[PDB]
RNA sequence: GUUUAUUAAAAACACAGCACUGUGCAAACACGAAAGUGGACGUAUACGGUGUGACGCCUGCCCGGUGCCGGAAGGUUAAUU
RNA sequence: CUUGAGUCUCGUAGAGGGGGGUAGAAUUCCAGGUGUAGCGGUGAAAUGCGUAGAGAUCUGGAGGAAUACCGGUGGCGAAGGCGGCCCCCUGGACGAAGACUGACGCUCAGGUGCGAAAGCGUGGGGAGCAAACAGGAUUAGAUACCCUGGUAGUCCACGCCGUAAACGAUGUCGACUUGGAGGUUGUGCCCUUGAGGCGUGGCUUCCGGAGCUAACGCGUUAAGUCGACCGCCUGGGGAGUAC
């Protein structure tokens, strides 16, 4: 995914990158290694993962 | 919990003139002064059951100490109840 | 206050009434009563054009100040009365300079209070402010629709037009219709609700309440004949057309709005 | 929970341990389940329970010697 | 009395409304035999996340002691002030009203780190130097 | 309560409430040649109109066809250049 | 009389209760800026949502439940019970000296008062989730199992009978029976050198002796030695219903 997006934006004419991260999901490091392989520096791996002040009740999921 | 200068008025007017806090009349008057303070809260707040727990402590002990007092000196009882203007 | 029936007679079952000790138990001072009278639905032509309007009490009228303009001058709040011609209560304010008005009631009603104007003085109900100077979430009493046109928004008892934004150059306020508008900040309003806040537990409880309010009864459309209303039925009533008024406009539809003068201020409106 | 705290010398692999001090825990851990108000008081509070293993472990070192396993 | 540490902040453009209200509030406090043990203005400061728009607000730290009655008319008034965005009033227990931890940082802000601009002349007209319109 | 003046006086109709919807006030709506006036000089806890019919418990599926409101990116399009 | 209990002023900790005020982030939403095709869900999946420009992302506000971590073996309540932050009203408990009264005691049918949660009538309000209901998925029952939509509901004020797993499944209050140490607090003493030690109370928690238990387990917060008085039980199903 990281590589899909990084190719196209050369036409927008970008040359250096920073990243904002938002989630508990998979691809923690392996998405960053691929941004680095598009020839960009990635010194800033900035978490902004939003923690609401205990938001809306989530889907119950299983009946136990 | 009551103001030093009100607690001193109560002691002056109730019990003996020795100016004690321990006697039957003045303990009745002090219990009342907290009941009356509690009754300022219970002008609203009718569902307020954790404080009510205190109201039944203070009433019970004022009933117990008037009951004692008519068993004890009859002058003190007959004076106290009329001087503290209780009931109808 | 409000006074509610114990259901001690037929016709008294669900009946609620408006009472205040402050109402004059004489007849109000007739040199300040400027005559209502009602028109029983009939226009210039001698036809009923407002249908199922007709009957009831005469229901006299007071001018009401719904603009609330006064520089700094006290009011004794001489009596609070019921107005039989509108839902809100109306005070006689008697100002201490010798001026009497009728004025629409606020959430305030304190005796010897002053109806103020200007920024540092107003923070109580009924004391005027430009709407920019009133905090977010405030319920607010009686708003001028545009500056000097007078208080056309929130007039009935304890209703309110609650502020929901007030940043930028305008004020955003919500209406109980489901509409939400931006309104220019130069309009007057006040903190707190409109007076007679307990009105909202009213039930009427008898067909006679509406009769003295001058509201005549009204038939089902399907229980008229096809000739007397186009919705009217044949054999066994036959609701089974689409619903319409007696003059043919689809009553559970249509957007008819063509105001074209105030349409710039509404950034959303009520929807079906 | 790659964690905002910056790892000494920047790299494409975050040093996620050395970054975190008390993050994700309580805040981003209870994903997609019905939120209770007071349940933590009886569900979670097992501090008393873990204090027993720490005493037991400090006792047993002396005792393996006294058995001569040591 | 019981000690109430009221601190509050004010939106710049609506700030002109508060300088008349604070001086009636300090007079309601000393008028009841409570005290103003400092009345510190800190100047304008940057909010981290916006409150009621704008990323900046103007700070006043009162250091009140006052009777319970008096605090009942005041809290309802500062909370329903439009010029104030928010206020917080702190507990009686173990409470300071002297020797400010932020006294140096306040002076620094006032002297050197302020906006120094006309919208903040409106804020210096709302601090300790309060000026307010005639009614 | 209202009711085919008299052979239907009721089960129809009414009504509070209940649900739907139009209307932000120079209102929606109405009639009137149109000016205009009623609604209301009230105004959303207000007003017009629809179904059901106080009150305890409620109201399941669903627009196929038939009638009606509504919403939009845009190809063309009357009248028209 | 104090040896029980009650009480004054002094000092200390906290989410005990009731009612008010108030904000922003994420979901959600408006406005605006930018931008293209999937997004979403789960064991895995399909239903769902999307080109009318979704999803996402930057900026500011919106609305309403909720207020993360802080929230701890911590602390408060009588059992249930208590958590944004704050104020308004108010209980009960913990220490400590000086003083006071002097069995004023204990238990308690009936009893008045009083709800974790949802039920529930009317007014104010309502973002997300959800019984029901659809449809997917599973194994034939969304109403066994799993997911997505989606309604009453959840939320508040007041008002009606307080239910259960009301407890270390253990009533009350009180007398008596080797203690050490942790968590953590009033407080004498100490490189307060050690959330430690010793001096003495405090809840709270680990550990085990005398004793008790069918067994686990308890053990100074008893399930020990006892005291008085109360609540309540006498085979199961059918019945927490009948009457």
Swiss-Prot record, chain B:
Gene3D superfamilies (UniProt xref):
6.10.250.3130, S15/NS1, RNA-binding
Q: Which GO terms describe its biological process?
A: translation
Q: Which InterPro entries does its entry note?
A: Ribosomal_uS15, Ribosomal_uS15_bac-type, uS15_NS1_RNA-bd_sf
Coiled coil, from the record = none
Q: This protein is called what?
A: Small ribosomal subunit protein uS15
Segment forming the signal sequence: none
Gene name in the database record? rpsO
Assembly description: Part of the 30S ribosomal subunit. Forms a bridge to the 50S subunit in the 70S ribosome, contacting the 23S rRNA.
Per the record, the similarity remark reads: Belongs to the universal ribosomal protein uS15 family.
Function text: One of the primary rRNA binding proteins, it binds directly to 16S rRNA where it helps nucleate assembly of the platform of the 30S subunit by binding and bridging several RNA helices of the 16S rRNA. Forms an intersubunit bridge (bridge B4) with the 23S rRNA of the 50S subunit in the ribosome.
| Source taxon at top rank | Bacteria
Q: Which GO terms describe its cellular component?
A: cytosolic small ribosomal subunit
- Species this chain originates from: Escherichia coli O157:H7
A Pfam family it matches: Ribosomal_S15
Q: Which UniProt keywords apply?
A: Ribonucleoprotein, Ribosomal protein, RNA-binding, rRNA-binding
Q: Give one GO molecular function term.
A: structural constituent of ribosome
UniProtKB/Swiss-Prot annotation, chain C:
- GO cellular component labels: cytoplasm; cytosol; cytosolic large ribosomal subunit; DnaA-L2 complex
Q: Which keywords does this chain's UniProt record carry?
A: Acetylation, Ribonucleoprotein, Ribosomal protein, RNA-binding, rRNA-binding
What residue spans carry the Low complexity bias annotation?
Answer: 38-47
- Ribosomal protein listed as a keyword: yes
Can you tell which superkingdom this protein's organism belongs to? Bacteria
Give me the ranges of the annotated region Disordered.
27-52, 220-272
One biological-process term from Gene Ontology?
negative regulation of DNA-templated DNA replication initiation
Pfam families recorded for this chain?
A: Ribosomal_L2 (PF00181), Ribosomal_L2_C (PF03947)
| Record flagged with keyword Ribosomal protein | yes
Q: Name one GO molecular function term.
A: RNA binding
Q: Which residues, renumbered to this chain, carry the PTM N6-acetyllysine?
A: 241
- Please give the subunit comment from the record: Part of the 50S ribosomal subunit. Forms a bridge to the 30S subunit in the 70S ribosome, contacting the 16S rRNA. Interacts weakly with S6 in one of the 3.5 A resolved structures. In pull-down experiments interacts with CedA.
Q: What else is known?
A: This protein can be partially replaced in vivo by its H.marismortui (HmaL2) or human (L8, from the 60S cytoplasmic ribosome) homolog.
Role of this protein:
One of the primary rRNA binding proteins. Located near the base of the L1 stalk, it is probably also mobile. Required for association of the 30S and 50S subunits to form the 70S ribosome, for tRNA binding and peptide bond formation. It has been suggested to have peptidyltransferase activity; this is highly controversial. In the E.coli 70S ribosome in the initiation state it has been modeled to make several contacts with the 16S rRNA (forming bridge B7b, PubMed:12809609); these contacts are broken in the model with bound EF-G.
Hey, which family's this protein in?
A: Belongs to the universal ribosomal protein uL2 family.
From Swiss-Prot, chain D:
Would the keyword Ribosomal protein be found if you checked this record's keyword annotation?
yes
* Feature: compositional bias, Basic and acidic residues: 59-70
One annotated GO molecular function: structural constituent of ribosome
Renumbered residue ranges of the record's region Disordered? 42-70
**Any single GO BP term:** ribosomal small subunit assembly
InterPro entries reported for this sequence: Ribosomal_bS21, Ribosomal_bS21_CS, Ribosomal_bS21_sf
Cellular component aspect of the GO annotation: cytoplasm; cytosol; cytosolic small ribosomal subunit
Composition skew (Basic residues), residue ranges: 45-58
Any matching Pfam family: Ribosomal_S21
Q: What keywords were assigned to this record?
A: Ribonucleoprotein, Ribosomal protein, RNA-binding, rRNA-binding
Instruction: Tell me the superkingdom of the source.
Output: Bacteria
Per the record, the similarity remark reads:
Belongs to the bacterial ribosomal protein bS21 family.
Summary of subunit composition and partner proteins: Part of the 30S ribosomal subunit. In stalled ribosomes contacts ribosome rescue factor SmrB.
What this protein is reported to do is described as: Probbly involved in recognition of ribosome rescue factor SmrB in stalled/collided disomes; fusion of protein fragments to its N-terminus decreases ribosome rescue in the presence of SmrB.
Name of the featured protein: Small ribosomal subunit protein bS21
Q: Which organism is it from?
A: Escherichia coli (strain K12)
Its taxonomic placement starts with: Bacteria, Pseudomonadati, Pseudomonadota, Gammaproteobacteria, Enterobacterales
Q: Which gene encodes it?
A: rpsU
Curated annotation (Swiss-Prot), chain E:
> Which ranges are annotated Basic and acidic residues under compositional bias?
104-116
Q: What does this protein do?
A: Binds together with bS18 to 16S ribosomal RNA.
Q: Where is the composition biased (Acidic residues)?
A: 120-135
> Any idea which residues bear N6-acetyllysine here?
93
Q: Name one Pfam family in it.
A: Ribosomal_S6
Q: Which gene encodes it?
A: rpsF
Instruction: Please give a single GO biological process term from the UniProt record.
Output: cytoplasmic translation
Q: Which domain of life is it from?
A: Bacteria
MF terms in GO: mRNA 5'-UTR binding; small ribosomal subunit rRNA binding; structural constituent of ribosome
By sequence similarity, the record places it as follows: Belongs to the bacterial ribosomal protein bS6 family.
The ranges of region (Disordered) come to 98-135
Q: Which organism is it from?
A: Escherichia coli (strain K12)
What does its PTM field state? 5 different forms of the protein, varying only in the number of C-terminal glutamate residues, were isolated. The sequence shown is form bS6-6, which is the longest. The first two Glu are encoded by the rpsF gene, the other Glu are added post-translationally by the RimK enzyme.
The protein's assembly and partners:
Part of the 30S ribosomal subunit. Interacts weakly with uL2 in one of the 3.5 A resolved structures.
Task: Give the protein's recorded name.
Answer: Small ribosomal subunit protein bS6
Question: What UniProt keywords apply to this chain's record, in alphabetical order?
Answer: Acetylation, Ribonucleoprotein, Ribosomal protein, RNA-binding, rRNA-binding
Q: Which InterPro entries match?
A: Ribosomal_bS6, Ribosomal_bS6_CS, Ribosomal_bS6_sf, Ribosomal_S6_plastid/chlpt, Transl_elong_EF1B/ribsomal_bS6
* Gene Ontology cellular-component annotations: cytoplasm; cytosol; cytosolic small ribosomal subunit
Chain segments annotated as transmembrane: none
